Design an enzyme around this catalytic site. Structure first.
Site, PDB file in Angstrom:
ATOM      1  N   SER A 114       0.844  -1.184   0.000  1.00  0.00           N
ATOM      2  CA  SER A 114       0.000   0.000   0.000  1.00  0.00           C
ATOM      3  C   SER A 114       0.885   1.242   0.000  1.00  0.00           C
ATOM      4  O   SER A 114       2.109   1.170   0.143  1.00  0.00           O
ATOM      5  CB  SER A 114      -0.957   0.022   1.198  1.00  0.00           C
ATOM      6  OG  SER A 114      -0.242   0.264   2.383  1.00  0.00           O
ATOM      7  N   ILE A 120       6.959  -2.048   7.540  1.00  0.00           N
ATOM      8  CA  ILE A 120       6.758  -0.606   7.546  1.00  0.00           C
ATOM      9  C   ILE A 120       7.474  -0.024   6.338  1.00  0.00           C
ATOM     10  O   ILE A 120       8.653  -0.317   6.094  1.00  0.00           O
ATOM     11  CB  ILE A 120       7.235   0.027   8.860  1.00  0.00           C
ATOM     12  CG1 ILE A 120       6.542  -0.651  10.047  1.00  0.00           C
ATOM     13  CG2 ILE A 120       6.936   1.524   8.825  1.00  0.00           C
ATOM     14  CD1 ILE A 120       5.021  -0.641   9.980  1.00  0.00           C
ATOM     15  N   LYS A 121       6.765   0.807   5.583  1.00  0.00           N
ATOM     16  CA  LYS A 121       7.267   1.367   4.332  1.00  0.00           C
ATOM     17  C   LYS A 121       7.802   2.773   4.589  1.00  0.00           C
ATOM     18  O   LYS A 121       7.085   3.644   5.097  1.00  0.00           O
ATOM     19  CB  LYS A 121       6.162   1.353   3.279  1.00  0.00           C
ATOM     20  CG  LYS A 121       6.617   1.503   1.838  1.00  0.00           C
ATOM     21  CD  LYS A 121       5.521   1.013   0.904  1.00  0.00           C
ATOM     22  CE  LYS A 121       5.599   1.670  -0.457  1.00  0.00           C
ATOM     23  NZ  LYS A 121       4.578   1.123  -1.401  1.00  0.00           N
ATOM     24  N   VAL A 122       9.064   2.986   4.222  1.00  0.00           N
ATOM     25  CA  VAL A 122       9.793   4.207   4.540  1.00  0.00           C
ATOM     26  C   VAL A 122      10.458   4.729   3.270  1.00  0.00           C
ATOM     27  O   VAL A 122      11.215   3.985   2.636  1.00  0.00           O
ATOM     28  CB  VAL A 122      10.880   3.907   5.590  1.00  0.00           C
ATOM     29  CG1 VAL A 122      11.782   5.117   5.804  1.00  0.00           C
ATOM     30  CG2 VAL A 122      10.276   3.425   6.910  1.00  0.00           C
ATOM     31  N   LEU A 151       2.789  -1.047   5.016  1.00  0.00           N
ATOM     32  CA  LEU A 151       2.100   0.184   5.407  1.00  0.00           C
ATOM     33  C   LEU A 151       3.125   1.305   5.519  1.00  0.00           C
ATOM     34  O   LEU A 151       4.109   1.182   6.259  1.00  0.00           O
ATOM     35  CB  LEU A 151       1.389   0.051   6.765  1.00  0.00           C
ATOM     36  CG  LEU A 151       0.687   1.316   7.286  1.00  0.00           C
ATOM     37  CD1 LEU A 151      -0.463   1.720   6.379  1.00  0.00           C
ATOM     38  CD2 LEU A 151       0.185   1.091   8.691  1.00  0.00           C
TER      39      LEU A 151
END
Length: 352
Positions: free
Chosen positions: A43, A138-140, A107
């Site tokens: 996402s 976790i998307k960074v 996310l």
């Protein structure tokens, strides 16, 4: 045919769905996709903006949350975290079946934190704990601060999807930060075998930026050439003795993940990017329409490492023409952050 997803798995590439919504999960569709070869979910703020606007199952959730004293951001997070935790539960059997190598759901942290390493770390740790699932990433964004944060999060044992990569140099910097975080944990006697990181390297946006002014023999070729050179860099970095010493102790390699693989130019075949970038130890996340085009008339072949010499020659001509791909990469990352912040603000307004 549908079996192509399994054929691509046998070539060593996972195919993830670049979409997430409440109904995708609630309808049972995501669970069926995972039985049919889809291996994960990504996402981003644009994906959530479109989901919240169009999926009927959010209406009751928004009405419930507007009865509570919550900020728009917390309303968004409550919705998004719930979708991610539900998707993680659908994907958990797949994830556990491979020892935690597949079946991830990503996310992304708030775009406004992209240049704040400490704030990114704090939000990533919080979202990791809020989702409370071993298969959440976790998307960074891969800004300099994001690569700072990556090292810390890896040292904290958190799986990360590093996104908005368009640069081979920035990708190599990410690998080095990952390795430092892994080394820290090994020195502290902590586990590393369940830490997974992907490097989301964007495809179509490179061709979109350049093609209108390129000579004919290069139109539609730069993004694939850059990806093929990035994969050669990946082979060299992770097979070197320095990383082998970590992998011998249980460290996982970072994996390249091809993103922005929907074709945006109707002059090119709709499966161009998926067909062209299949190689071992990689991921490709695709939007729904591209997934269905690939099932219908895609081709499963180990194309990513073919004709690397021609990829190098093309990148040399790109430089000869005065296109600096490192300057381009920085601009495309900046533009992507602006676009994601615009989408985020657009999804927050109806939650006020």
């Amino acid at each position: 045919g549908m079996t192509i997803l399994s054929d691509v798995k046998a070539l060593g590439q996972q195919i993830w769905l670049d979409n997430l919504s409440r109904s995708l999960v609630q309808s049972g569709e995501l669970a069926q996709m995972l039985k049919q070869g889809v291996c994960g979910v990504t996402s981003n703020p644009a994906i959530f903006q479109k989901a919240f606007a169009g999926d009927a199952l959010y209406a009751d959730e928004v009405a419930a949350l507007k009865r509570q004293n919550l900020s728009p951001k917390q309303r968004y997070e409550t919705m998004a975290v719930a979708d991610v935790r539900a998707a993680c539960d659908v994907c958990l059997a797949e994830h556990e079946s491979t020892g935690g190598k597949t079946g991830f759901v990503s996310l992304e942290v708030s775009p406004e934190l992209a240049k704040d390493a400490q704030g990114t770390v704090e939000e990533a740790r919080r979202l990791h704990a809020a989702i409370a699932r071993k298969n959440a990433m976790i998307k960074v964004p891969a800004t300099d601060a994001g690569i700072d944060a990556l090292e810390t999060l890896v040292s904290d044992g958190i799986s990360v999807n590093l996104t908005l990569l368009f640069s081979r140099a920035q990708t190599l910097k990410a690998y080095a930060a990952y390795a430092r975080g892994i080394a820290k944990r090994l020195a502290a006697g902590q586990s590393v075998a369940h830490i997974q990181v992907v490097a989301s390297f964007f495809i179509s946006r490179v061709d979109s930026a350049l093609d209108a002014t390129l000579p004919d023999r290069l139109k539609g070729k730069t993004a694939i050439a850059l990806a093929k050179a990035a994969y050669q860099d990946w082979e060299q970095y992770f097979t070197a003795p320095e990383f082998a010493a970590l992998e011998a102790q249980g460290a996982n390699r970072v994996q390249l993940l091809w993103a922005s693989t929907g074709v945006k130019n109707p002059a090119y075949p709709d499966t161009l990017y998926v067909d062209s970038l299949i190689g071992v130890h990689t991921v490709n996340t695709v939007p729904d329409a591209t997934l269905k085009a690939f099932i219908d008339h895609g081709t499963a072949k180990a194309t990513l490492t073919e004709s690397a010499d021609e990829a190098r020659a093309r990148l040399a001509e790109i430089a000869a023409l005065g296109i600096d791909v490192e300057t381009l990469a920085a601009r495309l990352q900046e533009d992507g952050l602006k676009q994601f912040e615009e989408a985020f603000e657009k999804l927050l307004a109806p939650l006020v």
